[PDB]
Amino acid sequence: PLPLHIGGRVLVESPQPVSYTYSWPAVYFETAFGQSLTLKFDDDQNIFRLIVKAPVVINKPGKVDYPRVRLEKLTETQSTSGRFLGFALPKRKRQIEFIGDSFTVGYGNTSPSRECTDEELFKTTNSQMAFGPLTAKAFDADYQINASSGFGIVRNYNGTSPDKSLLSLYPYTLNNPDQLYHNKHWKPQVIVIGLGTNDFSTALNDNERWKTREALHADYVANYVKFVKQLHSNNARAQFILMNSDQSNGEIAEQVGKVVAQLKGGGLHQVEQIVFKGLDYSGCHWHPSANDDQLLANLLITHLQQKKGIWL
Amino acid sequence: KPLPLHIGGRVLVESPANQPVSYTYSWPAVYFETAFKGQSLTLKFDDDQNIFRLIVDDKAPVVINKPGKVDYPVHRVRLEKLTETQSTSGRFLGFYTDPSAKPLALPKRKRQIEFIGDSFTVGYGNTSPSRECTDEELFKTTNSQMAFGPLTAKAFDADYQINASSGFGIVRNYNGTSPDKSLLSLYPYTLNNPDQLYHNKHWKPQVIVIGLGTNDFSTALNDNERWKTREALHADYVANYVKFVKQLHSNNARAQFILMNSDQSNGEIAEQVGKVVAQLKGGGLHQVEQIVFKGLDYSGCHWHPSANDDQLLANLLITHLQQKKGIWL
């Protein structure tokens, strides 16, 4: 079993081969060295891409021996997990984290149709073609993509999972509250957060806890401000980009404007807003296409390239 | 013999027959520069409204206090207006020498920065040791060249314009005063009057710093004001601020904007500016950011930023601008 470098949140267990368990999107594993290799899998949940040359697809291998190398998770798993059991490594000083919802995940980004069954949706979701991994790869930065489709700051798509939010999900290694994530070597100089579409895309239902739109605004702003504050207090070198669409009549963007003002008013000044525009939304269910993802990546790339000493 | 000169700030240049070229000004922090080989210099003034400082080479500044209509007897030479004139103007009539002197290269500054604002941007009472100031003490202690704007420009060797006037807001001025006016309505003009629109094809600042909103929001609405609810004031402030920045951008495509405000008035000011930045970006004008400043002592006249506060705000701006690759294009 070769020494490994890991990107993304994984639970490491050492009973037998060391096992790596992951459920957040866009996880990867890299190795370096001979003239043979075998990847050991226990994953009937994900589609993967192996990069030795052009990428090769590995679809739901299950528990099998598969005979520089980069394995990248492509698909989204909100309710299940997958296991990888193993094979001079990359020493990337730059680190960037993307936090978000469907957009950040790459939900349906490679679908040529906006009409997708559940199966089509799973298969055409490619997190590695989403803006986050593209942006990271432009700077040769290690990346974590901590995102989950449908989730908001305080409110989720159409008031679904009212007991949850991206923020309640965020502290955990997997899609369950069994293990909290800590890695003292994970200290991204840049954090890009894209949340609010799900909080505001739909009207409040009568059985939700916000009884007026203003109450929702107030709760969203308060919690987003607190969130960036905790991230900062644990990582003094982080600089924040709060990224949102120009949709929902500007409601999302305005609440984020308030978040940014309030954070700066409180003394946390290393925070900026990006409002993105002009997407075709031609992926599944009117989500960003692969084209849209490249566009968004180009936006972030140009933005970060103008910031002196952003990585130091 | 008048020397070739360089002008900073908005100036009405007139060339009346059989008289010196006349430079008329009213906006704060105006300056005139010249350079020559020789040993004599006279400044011709027609200004009993301003205090100036004169900077000869590497020497300390010398104060010139309301010189009036006089010839002032005194290389690189920089003359700076210090004081604010809201209801009057002053004239400078040039740098005069002996005909044997050689004109030298004037400053060719590629960098240009503009500060738009209110009393904070002017430097209202900034050098006063006391927060109690009569009108005369307020006038004397106001030094625009020590406010954060000129200090920021000098760290980058940029030319600057300080288009600020005390008490004014985006839509609403201090305690609803001058309800027929705002900073925005004064802004188009070369001087303190509607008589001439300012146009300067060579003035295209890469950076524009706007600090406005303290006067819109620092006080409660009176009964006789046109906004009947606080929400009305917010809405009108946001729309006009957005409108203003768009207009500035439409005439100067290169300009990058910094909207700068205090953490005071319970955060009301910062919040409205957050909405402005968001609405600008949402409309496709992305080259805009917010700065919220904190931790001033406000020891100048009537609880305004001190000269110390001014240096602190300058350092804030300098550091911000230093981190921006290619901001000077």
Numbering used by the authors:
A (entry chain A): 27 to 41, 44 to 61, 63 to 81, 84 to 98, 108 to 127, 137 to 361
B (entry chain B): 26 to 99, 107 to 361
The authors write:
CE2 enzymes are acetyl esterases (that are generally not appended to other catalytic modules), which are reported to be active on synthetic aryl-esters and acetylated xylan. Here we report the biochemical properties and crystal structure of several CE2 members, both single-module CE2 enzymes and CtCE2, a component of CtCel5C-CE2. All three 3D structures reveal a bi-domain enzyme in which an N-terminal β-sheet “jelly roll” domain (around 130 residues) is linked to a C-terminal domain of approximately 220 residues. The C-terminal domains possess an atypical α/β-hydrolase (SGNH-hydrolase) fold, consisting of repeating β-α-β motifs that form a curved central five-stranded parallel β-sheet, in the strand order β2, β1, β3, β4, and β5 with strand β2 interrupted by loop insertion.
CtCE2 along with CjCE2B does not possess a side-chain residue equivalent to the Asp of a classical Ser-His-Asp triad. Instead, these enzymes display a catalytic dyad with stabilisation of the histidine provided by main-chain carbonyl groups. Instead of the more typical Ser-His-Asp, the “triad” geometry is completed through the Nɛ1 of His-791 making a hydrogen bond with the backbone carbonyl of Glu-788, in the case of CtCE2, whilst the equivalent interaction in CjCE2B is with the main-chain carbonyl of Cys-333. Based on their catalytic efficiencies, CtCE2 and CjCE2B exhibit a significant preference for acetylated glucomannan over xylan, whereas CjCE2A and CjCE2C do not distinguish between the two polysaccharides. Pull-down assays revealed that none of the Cellvibrio enzymes bound to insoluble cellulose. While the binding of CjCE2A or CjCE2C to polysaccharides could not be detected by ITC (unpublished data) or AGE, CjCE2B interacted with, β-glucan, albeit with ∼17-fold lower affinity than CtCE2, but did not recognize carboxymethylcellulose (unpublished data) or hydroxyethylcellulose. Although the two structurally characterised Cellvibrio esterases do not bind cellohexaose or cellulose, they do contain aromatic residues in the cleft that houses the active site. Thus, Tyr-665 in CtCE2 is conserved in the C. japonicus esterases (Trp-231 in CjCE2A and Tyr-206 in CjCE2B), while Trp-335 in CjCE2B is equivalent to Trp-790 in the Clostridium enzyme.
